[PDB]
Amino acid sequence: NNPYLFRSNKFLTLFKNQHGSLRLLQRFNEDTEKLENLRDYRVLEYCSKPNTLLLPHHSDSDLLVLVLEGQAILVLVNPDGRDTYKLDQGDAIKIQAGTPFYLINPDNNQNLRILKFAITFRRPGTVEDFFLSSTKRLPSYLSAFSKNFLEASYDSPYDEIEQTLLQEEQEGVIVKMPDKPFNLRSRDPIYSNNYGKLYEITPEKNSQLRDLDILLNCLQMNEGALFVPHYNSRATVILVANEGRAEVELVGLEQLRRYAATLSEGDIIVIPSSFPVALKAASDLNMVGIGVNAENNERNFLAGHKENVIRQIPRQVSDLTFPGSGEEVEELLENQKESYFVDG
Amino acid sequence: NNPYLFRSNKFLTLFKNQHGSLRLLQRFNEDTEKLENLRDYRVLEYCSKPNTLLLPHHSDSDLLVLVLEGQAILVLVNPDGRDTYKLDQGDAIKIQAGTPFYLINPDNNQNLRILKFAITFRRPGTVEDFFLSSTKRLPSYLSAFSKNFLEASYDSPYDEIEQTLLQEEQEGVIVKMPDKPFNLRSRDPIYSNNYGKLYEITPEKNSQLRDLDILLNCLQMNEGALFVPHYNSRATVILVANEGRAEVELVGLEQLRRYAATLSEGDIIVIPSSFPVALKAASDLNMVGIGVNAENNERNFLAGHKENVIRQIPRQVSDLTFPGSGEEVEELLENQKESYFVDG
Amino acid sequence: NNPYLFRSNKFLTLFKNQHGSLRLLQRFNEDTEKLENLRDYRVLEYCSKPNTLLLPHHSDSDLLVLVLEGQAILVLVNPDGRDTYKLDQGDAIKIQAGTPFYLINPDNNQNLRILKFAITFRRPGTVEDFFLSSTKRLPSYLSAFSKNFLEASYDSPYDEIEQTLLQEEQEGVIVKMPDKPFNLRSRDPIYSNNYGKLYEITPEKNSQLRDLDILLNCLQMNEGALFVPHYNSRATVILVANEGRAEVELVGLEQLRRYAATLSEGDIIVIPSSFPVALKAASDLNMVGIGVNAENNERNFLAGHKENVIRQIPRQVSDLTFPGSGEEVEELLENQKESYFVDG
């Protein structure tokens, strides 16, 4: 059917309690060979209720963290000290693999929802988190060292070590608690009219992204509006439905196939580069895109007034290309006065 | 037998009519594990009769285009306009993935033959072309969008859209029609004597090539001449027999094996880096090489006067290496007065 | 059991006679999917008795050569001449693929032991050596060319060619014989106290390494000493036991698993990035590490005074993380006065 659609149900729950949850999307190339180019990436979703803390741990992968909702205090621990960041909705930050960090939702009434995009390199497609704390879920990884190794390391009797560090205290890793971030809308939208806006941050313009060769964008569309047919020349975009519902039509050659699907909050659709795509906001809509192989990407439109490549074909060639006359093709293309987003 | 030989019959025909044809070579790692390093590349061959045009379309891959015969007008369509290039034999140009373009053979008596080297990244080993026009072969990809999406996009009744853009007109994509190119011989040959010449353009000296890490060369040899045993330290060269016949001897360790083969026009032989190779022109010969993993490649010769690494081994070591005496090895190596190409 | 342990018996013998031997470690991803990231590398070990020479040959791979014992004269042959290097214990040098070279152990009483780290790119995971000389083992690769090709190439009768170059002389490639090197201890150890020292050279500080994205280190520990629990954020370290015995404890998440093993001279253990590790010198110990994916690597300690990330966690957070009180965790961490290496 549609190898590019990942409904929230394809998300596997890693941990969850009354305070929040962490889920991991199935591998992109899990059920298909078509998404081979996405094998090194995993998408995780973290949600926590007000006044909670994700216990300290480090990941074996580089993480691109995005606040989709709420606000957080993020602390990064270095051997020599620590950095604290207050993250607001739309803020993004890269967490280099191996950095222990903890996350707090300081709000007293609002939930925190974070999207974590993981770039794996140790074990391709695999992401592991090492928690410093022993819980019902899993004991501290420090408890795996032998007693003799533990005693010599800390220069203390094992009973001391075990009672202070190893013994199980919390039940889970989310507990009720008693480089710098950049926001996706930190710049003018690259597309903007009465029907919608598109914010985009490319690796060419952000040092954090340059290393990862990833682009991020924020799409906001008024109900009924339509993002007209276009395609990206290089980037494959993982599109996440954050708020609202979207009707998407992706055209691909595998023969000519139309993959139509309606996305709901939490659903995900991957848009391969070169594949024409178009989408309709069934309700007011907000989506976040993460495009890999982003460097030097260009968006080509097939309809509308601005950046419409069809409108650049000489008439004597348009004429041989389409059934209509050169003049006819021209006039038709002239009919849509709007650009990028139009009334659907 | 020979996992490195690709006779023209391994070429699959994608499209063909009275005006021309487009063929695609089978994947290099199709029948063997030895050409793993070449999985991301595909070779296509395009041929068209005089006064024809390859209808507009874009590819999902970056293409390195090489005119092996004839001349062409190549037009690249950008969202903001278009670039036109007149390409002559030996001219090469990189077409970035996602760029719609059309090709014309303006000549009235001569055929156009182009070799397209594709660097894939969306789906490794796969190349797809999206044609704007509906033909007997395949309908426009625009016809795959839903009627409601089409009408809102162009702001016109579907009948208008269908009659002007979607309805099938041409029968095929080649129709009888009523960054800048660089030529392979744009510089002095790096090897040249009475028996042959070798033109070479490396990524170190050409910006278009630097990005792809590919080198191109043009080999022209007089019948009977011999390109003496040598090997490339880093680049694996895909050698295309353009004109004439060549007897090739490639030595490889898989044990010690001699792969001997006679190539005819259209045949292809891959020369793995480090493998000694030598070839004889059975007739006046012209071949084009495309070497991947090209950066910093060095050609080491095992015979002849210049660049003969054997001649650099100290005599007390030559002596322990070969059956003859140090002096004897030296004298023998001294016998061939010529370099690179010799009388066969 | 332990997918990361490679005892000397996993080494396959390529060649061996009374003068020395060359062995090749099995592919890292031979028996497991966990070491996928190491598929492009092979480890070879070369040992030769006093007054021997490894006959001239070139490799299809880039080699990082390390003298683990003894001394050698290494000659690199270029088309235009040759470079000679005298290598002492601890010296390292990169040999670019395709460079013919020979090795000599000039000492009259001491054995030469070299470790060759190969970075493959022609055929991933595969390494081939092309020897110029015909031996009982394998004939010269030049003997594979046809007689007519040989005669025209050297401009001499085949009998001459065969008698001087091709006929078998030596029995094997090690015969009794009648860019520049950098030493691993060419800089102050990055860690050093009464129990041990750690020398490290990163790609950031050495041009030869920068290209390969590899780091090298030399570890020397007094018997009884302990390299406390820590982990590398990016580099996966291939640890070679050069002298002495080590008790190693590697903790990994596959669930929480402790891989304990005692290494003897010649044994090898791979330490994946992010996996906590600790090791004890059962005897005075010297190990050499080769870390891939080295750029920007950071070592995080979990015990000891300096660079202990645990000691950077705020007390109100330590408190929620561990069973003990914030003050208690703090005090315990304060107990070990030493750093990096401690009395075991």
Cβ-based neighbours of C188, under 8 Å, separated by 6 or more:
none
Rounded Cα distance, B56 and B61, in Å: 15
Q: Give the CA distances from residue C206 to residues B342, C64, C200, C212, C216, in Å, rounded to whole numbers and listed in that order.
A: 43, 13, 11, 10, 10
Name which of A242, A245, A230, A237 is nearest A281 in CA terms: A245
Q: Give the chain B residue nearest A254 (alpha carbons).
A: B128
Rounded Cα distance, C259 and C272, in Å: 12
C215, C200 contact by CB (below 8 A) = yes
Rounded Cα distance, C173 and B320, in Å: 10
Contact C274 A58 (CB under 8 A): yes
A76, A95 contact by CB (below 8 A) = yes
B301, B228 contact by CB (below 8 A) = yes
C293 CB neighbours in chain A (<8 A) are 121
- DSSP string spanning B148-176? HHHHHHHTS-HHHHIIIIIS---SSSEEE
Point out the residue among A77, A97, A124 whose CB comes nearest to the CB of C312. Answer: A77
Rounded Cα distance, C232 and A251, in Å: 44
Name which of A308, A297, A261 is nearest A5 in CA terms: A261
Half-sphere exposure in the Cβ direction for B328 (13 Å, CA): 14
Token pair, residue A102, equals: 């903890």
Best residue in A296, A320, A336 for a mutation probing chain B (most B CBs within 10 Å) = A320
Contact B251 C141 (CB under 8 A): yes
Rounded Cα distance, C48 and C111, in Å: 6
Rounded Cα distance, A320 and A325, in Å: 8
Best residue in C147, C163, C164, C166 for a mutation probing chain B (most B CBs within 10 Å) = C164
B271, B277 contact by CB (below 8 A) = yes
- DSSP string spanning C95-151? E-TT--EEEEE--SS--EEEEEEEE--SSTT---EEESS--SS---GGGGS-HHHHH
Interface of B with A in 130-149 (CB under 8 A): 130, 132-134, 138-139, 141-146, 148-149
Contact A36 B123 (CB under 8 A): yes
B263, B227 contact by CB (below 8 A) = no
Q: Give the chain C residue nearest A157 (alpha carbons).
A: C332
> What CATH number was assigned to the domain covering residues A1-178?
2.60.120.10
Rounded Cα distance, A244 and A257, in Å: 26
Strands of A169-255 (E only): list them. 174-176, 182-183, 191-192, 196-201, 214-221, 225-232, 236-243, 246-253
Rounded Cα distance, A183 and A88, in Å: 8
C213, C204 contact by CB (below 8 A) = no
Identify the three-state secondary structure at position A52.
strand
Residues composing chain A: 344
Strand partners, B16: B21
What does the CA dihedral C31, C35, C37, C39 come to, rounded to 10 degrees? Answer: -30
Chain C nearest-CA distance from A235, in A, is: 25
Chain A nearest-CA distance from C171, in A, is: 44
Q: How many CB atoms lie within 10 A of CB A135?
A: 18
Rounded Cα distance, C130 and C141, in Å: 7
A294, A302 contact by CB (below 8 A) = no
Point out the residue among B78, B102, B166 whose CB comes nearest to the CB of A317. Answer: B102
Delimit the domains of chain B by residue range. Answer: 1-178, 179-342
Q: How many CB atoms lie within 10 A of CB A204?
A: 12
Name which of B60, B3, B59, B62 is nearest B33 in CA terms: B3
Quick one: which H or E segment has residue A161? helix A158-161
Point out the residue among C234, C255, C274 whose CB comes nearest to the CB of A138. Answer: C255
Strand partners, B65: B93, B116
Which residues have a C–N gap over 2.5 Å right after them in chain A?
178, 254
Rounded Cα distance, B275 and B235, in Å: 11
- DSSP string spanning B201-239? E-GGG-HHHHHHTEEEEEEEE-TTEEEEEEEESSPEEEE
Strand partners, A167: none
Q: How many CB atoms lie within 10 A of CB B80?
A: 9
Rounded Cα distance, A145 and A134, in Å: 13
C115, C240 contact by CB (below 8 A) = yes
Contact C155 B335 (CB under 8 A): yes
Q: Give the chain B residue nearest A322 (alpha carbons).
A: B165
Helix axes A326-335, B147-154, angle to 10 degrees: 90
Chain A nearest-CA distance from C63, in A, is: 23
Token pair, residue A280, equals: 């309709």
Rounded Cα distance, A76 and C82, in Å: 52
Rounded Cα distance, C36 and C115, in Å: 22
Rounded Cα distance, C192 and C177, in Å: 41
A332 CB neighbours in chain B (<8 A) are 154, 156, 160-161, 164-165
Identify the three-state secondary structure at position B303.
coil
Contact B274 C98 (CB under 8 A): yes
Q: Give the CA distances from residue C340 to residues A202, C278, C311, in Å, rounded to whole numbers and listed in that order.
A: 41, 10, 14
Cβ-based neighbours of A162, under 8 Å, separated by 6 or more:
none
Point out the residue among B97, B139, B154 whose CB comes nearest to the CB of A335. Answer: B154
Whether A303 has its CB under 8 Å from any CB of chain B: the answer is yes
A195 CB neighbours in chain B (<8 A) are none
Quick one: which H or E segment has residue A209? helix A207-212
Q: How many CB atoms lie within 10 A of CB C13?
A: 10
CA A331 vs. chain centroid, Å, equals 40
Quick one: which H or E segment has residue C154? helix C147-154
Is the C-alpha dihedral spanning C218, C222, C223, C226 positive or negative? negative
B146, B99 contact by CB (below 8 A) = no
Q: Give the chain C residue nearest A99 (alpha carbons).
A: C233
Q: Give the chain A residue nearest B176 (alpha carbons).
A: A320
Interface of C with B in 181-210 (CB under 8 A): none
Q: How many CB atoms lie within 10 A of CB A45?
A: 21
**Topology alike, domains C1-178 and C179-342:** yes
Quick one: which H or E segment has residue C192? strand C191-192
C229, C339 contact by CB (below 8 A) = no
Cβ-based neighbours of C147, under 8 Å, separated by 6 or more:
C158
- Region of C195 please: left (phi>0), alpha (psi -120 to 50) or beta: alpha
Name which of B293, B249, B291 is nearest C124 in CA terms: B293
C332 by Cβ neighbours in 10 Å (0-12 / 13-18 / 19+) ranks as buried
Q: Could you identify the residue written with the tokens 């149900």? A: A9
Rounded Cα distance, B271 and B289, in Å: 10
Chain B nearest-CA distance from C173, in A, is: 9
Quick one: which H or E segment has residue A334? helix A326-335
Chain A nearest-CA distance from C169, in A, is: 48
CA C116 vs. chain centroid, Å, equals 6
> How many inter-chain contacts (A to B, CB under 8 Å) are there?
164
Name which of B140, B125, B141 is nearest B24 in CA terms: B125
A78 CB neighbours in chain C (<8 A) are 309, 312
Rounded Cα distance, A118 and A43, in Å: 6
Rounded Cα distance, A73 and A54, in Å: 11
C120, C40 contact by CB (below 8 A) = yes
- Region of C333 please: left (phi>0), alpha (psi -120 to 50) or beta: alpha
Q: Does domain A179-342 have CATH number 2.60.120.10?
A: yes
- To one decimal, the resolution in angstroms is 2.1
Rounded Cα distance, B339 and B189, in Å: 14
Amino acid (one-letter) located at C335: N
Name which of A105, A55, A104, A16 is nearest C322 in CA terms: A55
C240, C5 contact by CB (below 8 A) = no
Strands of A152-224 (E only): list them. 174-176, 182-183, 191-192, 196-201, 214-221
Contact A312 B124 (CB under 8 A): no
Contact C79 B301 (CB under 8 A): yes
Q: How many CB atoms lie within 10 A of CB C157?
A: 12
